[PDB]
Amino acid sequence: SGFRKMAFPSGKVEGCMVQVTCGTTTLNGLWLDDVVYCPRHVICTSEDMLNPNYEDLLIRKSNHNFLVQAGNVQLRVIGHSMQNCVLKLKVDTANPKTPKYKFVRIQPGQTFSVLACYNGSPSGVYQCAMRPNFTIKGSFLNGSCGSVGFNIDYDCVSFCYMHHMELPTGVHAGTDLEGNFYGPFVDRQTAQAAGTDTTITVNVLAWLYAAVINGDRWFLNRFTTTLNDFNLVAMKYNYEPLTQDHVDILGPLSAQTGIAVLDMCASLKELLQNGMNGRTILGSALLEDEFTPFDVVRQCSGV
Amino acid sequence: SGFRKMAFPSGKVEGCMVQVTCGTTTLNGLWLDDVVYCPRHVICTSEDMLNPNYEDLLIRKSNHNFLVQAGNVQLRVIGHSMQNCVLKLKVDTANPKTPKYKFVRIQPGQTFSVLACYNGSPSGVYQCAMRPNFTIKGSFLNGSCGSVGFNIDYDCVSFCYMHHMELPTGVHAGTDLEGNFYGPFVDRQTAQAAGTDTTITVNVLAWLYAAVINGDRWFLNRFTTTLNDFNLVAMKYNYEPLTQDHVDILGPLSAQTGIAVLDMCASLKELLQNGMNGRTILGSALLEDEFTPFDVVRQCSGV
Numbered sequence A, B: 001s002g003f004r005k006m007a008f009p010s011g012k013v014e015g016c017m018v019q020v021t022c023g024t025t026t027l028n029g030l031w032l033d034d035v036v037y038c039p040r041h042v043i044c045t046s047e048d049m050l051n052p053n054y055e056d057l058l059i060r061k062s063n064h065n066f067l068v069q070a071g072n073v074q075l076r077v078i079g080h081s082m083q084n085c086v087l088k089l090k091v092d093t094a095n096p097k098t099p100k101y102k103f104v105r106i107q108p109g110q111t112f113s114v115l116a117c118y119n120g121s122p123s124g125v126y127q128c129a130m131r132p133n134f135t136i137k138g139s140f141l142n143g144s145c146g147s148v149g150f151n152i153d154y155d156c157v158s159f160c161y162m163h164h165m166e167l168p169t170g171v172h173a174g175t176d177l178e179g180n181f182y183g184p185f186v187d188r189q190t191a192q193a194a195g196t197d198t199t200i201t202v203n204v205l206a207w208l209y210a211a212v213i214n215g216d217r218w219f220l221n222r223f224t225t226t227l228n229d230f231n232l233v234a235m236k237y238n239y240e241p242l243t244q245d246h247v248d249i250l251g252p253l254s255a256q257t258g259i260a261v262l263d264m265c266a267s268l269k270e271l272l273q274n275g276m277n278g279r280t281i282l283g284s285a286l287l288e289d290e291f292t293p294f295d296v297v298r299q300c301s302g303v
C-alpha cells in the first residue's frame, strides 16, 4: 500500500501567511485574529546581527515602521510588543480566514508540517521532526524566516514552530509561537552548537513496524532481547534510550502485526551491529527516525 | 540550506475534493465548474471487478444513482458520461472554489504533488514521479481512489493524475483527467505487469547537483567521460539513456555550480560501479531519482 513522508494539507495555514517589512528586511508573518506574529530580527540591520540589543532596536521603531501586506492589501498596525524572540503586531483587521487554532510547544521526536514561504506566499510543504537536539532538517533559503510548522487536529491547527535561522551543519532552528527557541539557540550571528544529533529510537521502531505492515520483513531475526540489553546497544549508536512509555506507545503496532516490541528491538540491534548489506527498507538504505508511531498508525489506518 | 522532498501547497485543490457514492462504493471526485470527475469503477461490485463491461454496468445507472457530497451538502447530478476510465457527473452547482486549472498528460520522469483523500476529505500531501514504467511510489489505502496529482503554475493548477489501483509490487497506477491510464494498465482485477523499473538518469544528476550546491561534494572524482561511455554504464544499471536534451536541461545547474554535466556523469559512473561505502548524499544512502532539474532549481532558487 506504500509508506511516504506526508505533510498535512496546508490550505488553512496558507490564508494566514502575510508579508512583514521593517526598513530593508522582508519576511513572513502569521496573521491570526487581529495579531500578526513574526521573528523580532525583522528590525535588525546586516551589522546589528552580530550583537543586537532588541529592546533598544525596537525603541527606535513605531507602529507605522511595520509594513504588513496580506496579498495586495496593506494592514494598519495599531500596536506592537516583543514576546521573547517574536514580534506581535496588533492590526485593525481580524483575519477573516483565521482557522480554529492553538499554540503548542512540541516535544523532541514529534513531527509537524512546514509550509515554506517567501514574501508571504506559500512555496511548498514538507514533514520535519523536532530532533532530540532541538534542530530540524529543513529546506530554508533567504526569505523563509517566519515560515511556520503545524499539526491539524481534524479542524484545529496546532502551530508549533516559526523559522529563524540556519546552523553551520546545514540544519535549522526556530521558536514556538510565544517566541521561545527550541534548544539553546539565540537570534544573533555567532558560533552556536547543536549538541550530538541522537536518533529517535521509538520512531525507528515505528518505521520497522510500517515496513512489516507493508510486507518488508527480511530484517526480522530469530532472536529477542531485554530493554537494558537493547539500551546498552542504543547508547553505543547515539540512539535515545527506550522506556516502558515508548513500549506502550508502540502497542497498537505490536497488536496489529503480532510482533512483540522486544522482538523488533532484537532486529534493530542486528541492523545497528551488521548494517543493511546494500538492502533497503521502505525504499531507504538507512534507518529512518522522522516517523512517529501516530504518523505510522495515521498512514497505516488512513486518518 | 537543505534539500527536501517538497509538495505544492494543497489549498486550491482541497476545495475541489468531493465524495462520490454509487451503491456501496464510496470514493473521491474532483469538482471543477459544473462537472465532477471520478474513477468509473465506482459503479462496480466486488465480483464485477474480475471482468467488468463498464458500458453495460453504466446502462443500469441513472443521474439519481450518484451521490455527490461536498462537505455536508448534496449536489444534484443532472447528467453523466464515461470518458475512457473516468466518469464525468454534470451537477446543477458550479464549484465556487474552482481555481484557474488545466488538464495535462505528464511525461515520465516529471513530478507532481498527490493530495491523498478519504471520503472526499484531504488527508495528506506528498511528491511523486511518474516513473519510466508509468507507475508511482505512493501511499494509498482503501478509499483513496479519485485522489489527484497536480502542479501549481503561480496561480494555475495543472491536474495530471487520478488514482485508480495498487500493483502487486506495492506500487500505484491511475489516469490523466481524460481517463487515459498512464502505462498499459486496465481497471479490472487481473494479473498486470509494470515493466522493468528504470532509473530517471537526468533526475539523479539534478540531485547530485543539489548535493554540490548544499556543500556535499565527496563523490566528485578527478575523471570525466563521454555520453556514449556513460550510457554504456547506464544500460548495465537500468538507467534511462542520457541525451543532449537532458544535458541542456541541466545547464542552469552546471552554470551555477561550475561542474560540466559530463564531469558529473563520471562521478555517477563510479558511484554506480563502486557503491557509496556506507556514506550518504543529502541524508540518503542511495541515489535519488524523484527530483527533476526544475524541482532542484525551484528549491535551490526559492520559487
Ligand SMILES: *[C@](O)(C(=O)NC1CC1)[C@H](C[C@@H]1CCNC1=O)NC(=O)[C@H](CC(C)C)N1C[C@@H](NC(=O)OCc2cc(F)cc(F)c2)CCC1=O
Binding pocket: A025, A026, A027, A041, A049, A140, A141, A142, A143, A144, A145, A164, A165, A166, A167, A168, A169, A170, A172, A186, A187, A188, A189, A190, A191, A192, B001
Ligand atoms: C531569515 O532571517 C530570513 O529568511 N530573512 C529574510 C532574507 C531577509 C534567515 C533564514 C536563513 C538564511 C539563509 N537560510 C535560512 O534559513 N535567517 C537569518 O538570517 C539568521 C539571522 C540571525 C539573527 C538568527 N541567520 C544569520 C546568519 N547567522 C550566522 O552567521 O551564525 C554563525 C554561523 C552560522 C552557520 F550556519 C555557519 C557558520 F560557520 C557560522 C546566517 C545564518 C542565519 O540563519
Ligand SMILES: *[C@](O)(C(=O)NC1CC1)[C@H](C[C@@H]1CCNC1=O)NC(=O)[C@H](CC(C)C)N1C[C@@H](NC(=O)OCc2cc(F)cc(F)c2)CCC1=O
Binding pocket: A001, B025, B026, B027, B041, B049, B140, B141, B142, B143, B144, B145, B164, B165, B166, B167, B168, B169, B170, B172, B186, B187, B188, B189, B190, B191, B192
Ligand atoms: C480504490 O478503488 C478505492 O480506494 N476504492 C474505495 C474503497 C472503496 C482502490 C485503491 C487501492 C485499494 C487498496 N490500496 C489502493 O490503492 N483501488 C481498487 O480497488 C482497484 C480496483 C480495480 C478495478 C482497478 N484494485 C482491485 C484489486 N485488483 C487486483 O487484485 O489486481 C490483481 C493483483 C494486484 C496486486 F496488487 C497483487 C496481486 F497479486 C494481484 C486490488 C488492487 C486494486 O488497486
